Design a protein around this ligand. Structure first.
Ligand SMILES: OC[C@@]1(O)OC[C@@H](O)[C@@H](O)[C@@H]1O
Ligand SMILES: OC[C@@]1(O)OC[C@@H](O)[C@@H](O)[C@@H]1O
Ligand SMILES: OC[C@@]1(O)OC[C@@H](O)[C@@H](O)[C@@H]1O
Ligand SMILES: OC[C@@]1(O)OC[C@@H](O)[C@@H](O)[C@@H]1O
Ligand SMILES: OC[C@@]1(O)OC[C@@H](O)[C@@H](O)[C@@H]1O
Ligand SMILES: OC[C@@]1(O)OC[C@@H](O)[C@@H](O)[C@@H]1O
Lengths: 90, 90, 90
């Protein structure tokens, strides 16, 4: 089984985040113009998607991690990853 | 097996749409700033991807639903989901 | 068993790019307002994700193609697809 990725970007530099689900574990690689480095994201999940939006120059990322029929939303709003209010009855 | 998701967002509130493939069916959950609810999208499919774009204040969404090697495009343009012109030789 | 897609778009026409992973081959279908056609992207991979951003009117596209634990970044920056500096630790 191949890894599964999800990717988002913002601005014109750009900044890029790539999330990889590997055997149930989702980690994050980051680009800000000067080389790829490992990010703070680390959550369980066999499938992953992501969206993001800017307010001014402040980025907001939402990552959706799925295992079985359970999708968990994870939020970045400048100060650490927190669990979001997303629910879905599957 | 796990569900598969795809997400899109627009604006600064923001608005968020999350599409989930589950056992041959794709459904949609929506956020417009005050709680999650279930959206109009409801189409068969085992894999899903999405993109969207604003034209002034008007959002357009395209959802790509695939089963086997067949991929159907569904269009939102302000009032109702309609089948799109996408084709691909697979 | 179903094919896997990823989509991105830009501008207000819009331009759309849909990437399809089918049996270890990722190919590209393009829309610019006047009908669908096949693009120049052809790379090996079992999973695909995409992000894009505009620099003025010039589009920049990053496609992340994964097989096993290897993810390769492919870069469009106006004149041909080249391999990007993305690496990970998988
Ligand atoms: O690259 C730095 C960082 O804070 O940027 C925002 C998020 O992508 C975080 O996971 C990441 O650690
Ligand atoms: O600030 C976090 C939050 O309110 O952001 C908007 C949506 O993603 C919600 O699900 C989420 O809980
Ligand atoms: O959130 C309300 C709604 O009209 O927004 C646009 C589309 O996502 C529709 O499916 C959805 O029901
Ligand atoms: O308005 C619908 C439509 O023209 O929008 C742009 C593309 O998504 C086309 O495939 C689609 O048929
Ligand atoms: O539509 C023409 C084209 O050059 O546009 C940019 C990239 O998507 C290329 O693969 C594609 O062939
Ligand atoms: O111009 C190519 C490049 O520098 O663009 C930004 C990032 O996608 C890098 O991985 C990539 O090598």
């Amino acid at each position: 089984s191949s890894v599964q990725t999800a990717a988002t970007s913002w601005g014109t530099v750009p900044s890029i985040r790539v999330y990889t689900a590997n055997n149930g574990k989702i980690t994050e690689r980051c680009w800000d113009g000067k080389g790829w480095y490992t990010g703070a994201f680390n959550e369980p999940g066999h499938n992953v998607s992501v969206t993001s939006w800017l307010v001014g120059s402040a980025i907001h990322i939402r990552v959706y991690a799925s295992t079985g029929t359970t999708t968990t939303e994870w939020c970045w709003d400048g100060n650490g990853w927190t669990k979001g209010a997303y629910t879905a009855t599957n």
